[PDB]
Amino acid sequence: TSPLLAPVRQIHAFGDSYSDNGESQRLTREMLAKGIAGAQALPGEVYWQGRWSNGPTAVEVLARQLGAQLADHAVGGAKSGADNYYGWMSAYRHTGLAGQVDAYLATLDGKPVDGQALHFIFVSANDFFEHEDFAGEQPLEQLAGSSVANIRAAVQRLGEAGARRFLVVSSTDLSVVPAVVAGNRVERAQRYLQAVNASLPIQLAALRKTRGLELSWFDHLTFSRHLRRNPARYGLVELDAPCQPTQPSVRPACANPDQYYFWDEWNPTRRVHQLAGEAMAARYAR
């Protein structure tokens, strides 16, 4: 191992349901109040305090472990570009990674980016989910290239504005996601995530070096492979079934949620988010 990185007292997080700590719930509640066309309540009824899980997301745990305040801009459904898996949001707000970056910079209103804040980016799952669910055009290799370019562009734009510290999360293992398994799309997910995870860190390392950034890469796929190979070590029993099924309809939750990897058909449980946040924190001093 190398020296730990310097301590973190503020996180700005950008991404999707794997980070969102209330924004999709806040926004959809607003959109419902205003009768926006297409609006639905997200994440829905069988979730903990607006998270797309049964407890805090990984970045919430990371902030807790490091002793940092968290400003979490992530929105369930977010893609790596401007918009969301949920097309009906685009009219009201651009809630993709690029949209979240735009909005963060607009809120600063000319005032400086906190050069000590950790800018946490965790996105790309919805690029794949949207493509597969609405028969996207692009070959998966091109889709991956798009996701990678979008994330690199976000880091570039944040650094441009004054950000100096980043943590970028890899693709997760989409190939074991229960919705992917049920769509018989394991190989497509493998191909997509491998493409993202091979290319992105090469591009980020070049940007790190050009702009003098601190940029750490978290390999979520290595993380999940290690968990799922040795589950009893971590107290996990059921790696595949959702604890809280929602497809085709909501059923009763499993008795022991901390023994489950998945909460719903797309999202990990609070236990996996805890382990993930602890692993992300391992690179930093308290």
Ligand SMILES: CC(=O)SCC[N+](C)(C)C
């Ligand atoms: C990574 C996430 O935001 S999971 C959301 C999955 N869904 C939008 C396709 C239902």
